[PDB]
Amino acid sequence: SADLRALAKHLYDSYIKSFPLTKAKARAILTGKTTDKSPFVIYDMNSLMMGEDKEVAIRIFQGCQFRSVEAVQEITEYAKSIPGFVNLDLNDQVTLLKYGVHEIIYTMLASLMNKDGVLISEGQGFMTREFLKSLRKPFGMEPKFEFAVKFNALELDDSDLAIFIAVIILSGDRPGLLNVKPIEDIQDNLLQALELQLKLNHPESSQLFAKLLQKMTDLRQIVTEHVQLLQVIKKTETDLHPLLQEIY
Ligand SMILES: O=C(O)Cc1ccccc1Nc1c(Cl)cccc1Cl
C-alpha cells in the first residue's frame, strides 16, 4: 500500500515536470485567482484577428494541429517516466502512444475548459465555445466540450490525472501490440494505484474509480469521430506534421 502511494507520487512528479500547464494553474486562470494572470478572450472573427496580436477557420485548425503536436511531445516525455514503459518492446512503445495520445489530449483538454470555452497557448488565450460552434465550414470542438463538462464534474486534480493518464497509455488492448502481457502487468499496477489514490483523495466520493474508467468509453467515441473528420478534411484540402502524419 505504501508502494502504491510512492508510485502515485512518482507519476505526479513526472506529470508536473512534463506538462507546463496543469489543471490547477488553468483553474486559477479561469476563476480570476490572483496567483495567475487573466487571459485575452477570442469570441468572434473581429476579436479573433484582434487576438492574433497576440481563411480563419483553416488558420485555427492548423493552430489546433500545432498544439496537438506539442501535446504529443509532452505526453511522450511523460510516458518515458512510467515504470516499465521504456523496458517494453520498442514497436509496442510506439504502438501504445500512437493510439493513446488523442485520448489523453481530450482528457487534459477538459482541464482547459468550462461550459463557455477553452484556454489556449498556455493560458494566454480563451477561445469561446460559441465562437467555435459558429466557425465553418467544416468546423464543429462541440463534443469535446460536452465530455469536458461531464469529465470536470468528477473534480479530479492533477495527481489524479497523472495516474489516470498512465493507465490510458498502458492499454494492452491496443491493436498490433506484440507482447500484451507485460503492458497489462504495468497497467494493473497503475490501476491498483489509481484505486488507492482516488480512495484517499476523494474519500466522500463513491465509485469514482468505476466512474473514472467509464469515461474511457466517451474518449473512444470522441477520438473515432475526430479521425473521421480529419480524413474528410484531408481529401477536401490538398495542401500534417511528420509526427501528425505518423499517427494518422
Ligand atoms: O492550445 C492549447 O493549449 C489547447 C490545446 C489545443 C489542441 C491540442 C492541445 C492543446 N493543449 C494541450 C497541451 Cl499543449 C498539452 C497536453 C494536453 C493539451 Cl489538451
Q: Specify the CATH number for the domain of residue 236.
A: 1.10.565.10
DSSP 134: T
Which residue minimizes the CA distance to atom 4 of ligand 1?
120
CA–centroid distance, 105 to ligand 1, in Å, is 7
Residue 58 neighbours by CB distance under 10 Å: 11
Classify 169 as helix, strand or coil.
helix
Nearest-angstrom CA–CA distance, 192 and 176: 25
Pairing of strands 113-114, 117-120: antiparallel
Nearest-angstrom CA–CA distance, 3 and 147: 33
Tell me the CB-side half-sphere exposure of residue 246, using CA atoms within 13 A. Answer: 13
CB-ligand 1 contact for 66 (6 Å cutoff): no
Pick the closest to residue 165 from 194, 195, 199 (CA basis).
194
CA–centroid distance, 205 to ligand 1, in Å, is 28
* Contacting residues for 21 by C-beta, under 8 A, at least 6 apart: 111, 112, 119, 122, 123
CB-ligand 1 contact for 74 (6 Å cutoff): yes
Nearest-angstrom CA–CA distance, 55 and 47: 15
Type of residue found at 200: L
Nearest-angstrom CA–CA distance, 29 and 9: 25
* Contacting residues for 124 by C-beta, under 8 A, at least 6 apart: 39, 40, 54
CA–centroid distance, 2 to ligand 1, in Å, is 33
Pick the closest to residue 143 from 224, 65, 74 (CA basis).
224
CB-ligand 1 contact for 64 (6 Å cutoff): yes
CB-ligand 1 contact for 113 (6 Å cutoff): no
What does the angle CA 25 – CA 83 – CA 243 come to, to the nearest 5 degrees?
A: 65
Pick the closest to residue 70 from 147, 30, 22, 18 (CA basis).
18
For residue 150, give the C-alpha cell.
461531464
Classify 114 as helix, strand or coil.
strand
Query: Where the chain is broken, by preceding residue (C–N > 2.5 Å)?
Result: 54, 140, 239
What does the angle CA 99 – CA 3 – CA 172 come to, to the nearest 5 degrees?
A: 20
Residues recorded for the chain: 248
For residue 179, give the C-alpha cell.
507482447
Type of residue found at 6: A
Which residue minimizes the CA distance to atom 13 of ligand 1?
71
Are 189 and 55 in contact, with CB atoms under 8 Å apart? Answer: no
Pick the closest to residue 97 from 82, 117, 113, 119 (CA basis).
82
Which helix (H) or strand (E) element contains residue 183?
helix 181-201
What radius of gyration do the chain's Cα atoms show? 18
Classify 21 as helix, strand or coil.
coil
CB-ligand 1 contact for 109 (6 Å cutoff): yes
Give the range of the structural domain holding residue 143, as residue numbers without chain letter: 1-248
Pairing of strands 40-42, 125-128: parallel
Instruction: Give helix 181-201 / helix 208-236 axis angle, nearest 10°.
Output: 120
Measured over the CA atoms of residue 228, residue 79, residue 71 and residue 132, the dihedral's sign is positive
Residue 8 neighbours by CB distance under 10 Å: 22
Q: How many domains does the chain have?
A: 1
DSSP 110: G
Nearest-angstrom CA–CA distance, 87 and 128: 42
Transcribe 42-108 into DSSP letters.
E-SHHHHHHGGG--HHHHHHHHHHHHHHHHHHHHHHHHTTSTTTTTS-HHHHHHHHHHHHHHHHHHH
Which residue minimizes the CA distance to atom 12 of ligand 1?
71
Annotated binding site for rosiglitazone: 65-68, 102, 226, 248
Residue 197 neighbours by CB distance under 10 Å: 24
What ligand 1 atom has the least distance to the C-alpha of 70?
14
